[PDB]
Amino acid sequence: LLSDKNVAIIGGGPVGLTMAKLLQQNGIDVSVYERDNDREARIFGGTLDLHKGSGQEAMKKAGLLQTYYDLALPMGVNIADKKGNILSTKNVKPENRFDNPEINRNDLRAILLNSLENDTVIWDRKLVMLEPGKKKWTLTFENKPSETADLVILANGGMSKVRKFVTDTEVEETGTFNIQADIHQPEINCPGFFQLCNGNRLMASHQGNLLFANPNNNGALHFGISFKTPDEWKNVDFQNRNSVVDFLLKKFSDWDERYKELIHATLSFVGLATRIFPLEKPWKSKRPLPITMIGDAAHLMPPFAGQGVNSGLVDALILSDNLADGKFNSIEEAVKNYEQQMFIYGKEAQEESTQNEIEMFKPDFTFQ
Numbered sequence: 001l002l003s004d005k006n007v008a009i010i011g012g013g014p015v016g017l018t019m020a021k022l023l024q025q026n027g028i029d030v031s032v033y034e035r036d037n038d039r040e041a042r043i044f045g046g047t048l049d050l051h052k053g054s055g056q057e058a059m060k061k062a063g064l065l066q067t068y069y070d071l072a073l074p075m076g077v078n079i080a081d082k083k084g085n086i087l088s089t090k091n092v093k094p095e096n097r098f099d100n101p102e103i104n105r106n107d108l109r110a111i112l113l114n115s116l117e118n119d120t121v122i123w124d125r126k127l128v129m130l131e132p133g134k135k136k137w138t139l140t141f142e143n144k145p146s147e148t149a150d151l152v153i154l155a156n157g158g159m160s161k162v163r164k165f166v167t168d169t170e171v172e173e174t175g176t177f178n179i180q181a182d183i184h185q186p187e188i189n190c191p192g193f194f195q196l197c198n199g200n201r202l203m204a205s206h207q208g209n210l211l212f213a214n215p216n217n218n219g220a221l222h223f224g225i226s227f228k229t230p231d232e233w234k235n236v237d238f239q240n241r242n243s244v245v246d247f248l249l250k251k252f253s254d255w256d257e258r259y260k261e262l263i264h265a266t267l268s269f270v271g272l273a274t275r276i277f278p279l280e281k282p283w284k285s286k287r288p289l290p291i292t293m294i295g296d297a298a299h300l301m302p303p304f305a306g307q308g309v310n311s312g313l314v315d316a317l318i319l320s321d322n323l324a325d326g327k328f329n330s331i332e333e334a335v336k337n338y339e340q341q342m343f344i345y346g347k348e349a350q351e352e353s354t355q356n357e358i359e360m361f362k363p364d365f366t367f368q
C-alpha cells in the first residue's frame with residue numbers, strides 16, 4: 001500500500017541518501033534536496049563504521065554491503081599514553097575484519113549515489129522553509145524554485161532548523177568540545193605521529209584531554225582532540241591557526257614531543273561543541289501533514305560510542321519498511337510506528353554516548 005504520491009528528503013547525508021534508495025527500490029517517488037553545491041563537494045569528518053546488525057543491514061537491504069565491504073578498510077586500534085607508549089593493540093583478525101571496516105565519507109556517498117536513479121538528488125537546495133498547504137507541503141529553497149510533496153523526510157543533520165512541525169525540542173550543547181583536522185601526506189608531514197599509529201587507529205587519554213586519530217583516511221591523517229569545554233567560554237578563534245596551535249600546545253604541554261608535532265603540522269583546525277538532540281519529549285501527536293525525522297536530525301548525539309550513522313541507517317531501514325508495507329493503512333500510523341521503535345534505541349544509544357563521555361575526562365580510563 002501507499003503509492004501514487006511523492007516523498008521529499010531534505011538532506012543527502014549517509015542517512016538520507018540511504019533512505020532515497022530503500023524507497024526508490026520499493027517504487028516510491030523520492031527526491032533528495034541537498035544543500036551541497038555539487039556531488040564532488042569535499043566532506044569533512046572521518047570514517048564511518050557500519051556495524052554488522054545495524055548499519056550493515058541497511059547496506060544489505062539496498063544491495064550495497066559488498067560494495068561497502070569493497071571500499072571500506074578494516075582497522076586495528078592502538079591505545080597510547082601522553083608519553084607515546086603503546087599500552088595495547090587489537091589488530092584486525094581475518095574473520096571479524098568484516099565487523100566494522102572504516103569507510104571514507106565521500107566513498108560512502110559515491111556508493112549511495114550510484115545506487116540511486118539518475119537525478120534523484122537535486123543539488124544546490126538549501127531548504128529554508130516549510131509551509132503545510134492543501135494536500136501537501138510547500139518547500140522553499142534559498143534562490144531556487146519551491147517544490148511540493150506529500151511526505152517530507154527530514155535528514156538534514158543534527159542542526160536542522162525546520163524541526164518545529166515535529167517537535168519544539170531543541171539541541172543542547174553537551175559540555176565537551178571537539179577539535180579536528182586533516183593532515184595530508186601524513187607519512188612526511190607528521191612523520192613521528194604517523195609511525196606511532198603503525199597503520200592503526202590511535203586513542204590516547206591524559207588528564208581530561210582525549211586524542212584520537214586515523215592514519216589512513218584515503219591517504220589523509222584525520223585526528224580529533226576532545227576535552228571538557230573550557231569554563232571560560234560562553235554564549236580562541238579557529239580561523240586563526242597559531243592561536244588554536246598555542247591553546248593546544250598548552251593543553252598538550254606535558255605530552256610527548258611526537259603529538260606536538262601533529263598540532264604544529266596541521267594547517268586548519270575546525271571547532272565543534274558536542275551536542276545532543278534529546279529524545280526527552282515524545283514528538284508532536286498533532287501534525288498538520290505527513291512529516292518525520294531520521295538521522296542526526298532525529299537523535300543528534302555525542303560522537304563517542306560508534307552511533308550516529310548506524311542509528312540513522314537503522315531508522316532508515318525501519319521507517320522505509322513501514323511505508324512499503326501493505327501491512328499498514330494510514331501513513332500517520334506508518335511513521336508513528338517508526339517513531340515508536342527509534343525512541344527505544346536512540347535513547348539507548350544516547351544513553352550510551354552520554355555515558356561514555358562521562359567516563360573519559362574522568363581520571364585515566366581504559367577504552368572500548
Ligand SMILES: Cc1cc2nc3c(=O)[nH]c(=O)nc-3n(C[C@H](O)[C@H](O)[C@H](O)COP(=O)(O)OP(=O)(O)OC[C@H]3O[C@@H](n4cnc5c(N)ncnc54)[C@H](O)[C@@H]3O)c2cc1C
Binds near residue numbers: 178
Ligand atoms: C567528531 C565526530 C565523529 C563522529 N564519528 C562517528 C563515527 O565514528 N561513527 C558513526 O557511525 N558516526 C559518527 N559521527 C556522527 C555522524 O557523522 C552522523 O551521525 C552522520 O553523519 C549521519 O547524519 P546524516 O548523514 O544523518 O546527517 P549529516 O552527515 O549531518 O548529513 C546531512 C546532509 O544534509 C545536508 N543539509 C544540511 N542542512 C541542509 C538544509 N538546510 N537543506 C538541505 N540539505 C541540508 C548536509 O549538507 C548533508 O548533506 C561523528 C560525529 C562527529 C562530530
Ligand SMILES: C[NH+](C)c1cc(NC(=O)CNC(C)(C)C)c(O)c2c1C[C@H]1C[C@H]3[C@H]([NH+](C)C)C(O)=C(C(N)=O)C(=O)[C@@]3(O)C(O)=C1C2=O
Binds near residue numbers: 201
Ligand atoms: C568509548 N569511546 C572511546 C568509543 C567507544 C566506542 N564503542 C562503544 O561505545 C561500544 N561499546 C562496546 C565495545 C560495544 C562494549 C566507539 O565505537 C568509538 C569511541 C570513540 C570515537 C572516537 C572518534 C574519533 N574522533 C571523534 C576524533 C576518530 O578519530 C574517528 C576516526 N575513525 O577517525 C572516529 O570514527 C570516532 O568518531 C569513533 O569511531 C569513535 C568510536 O568508533
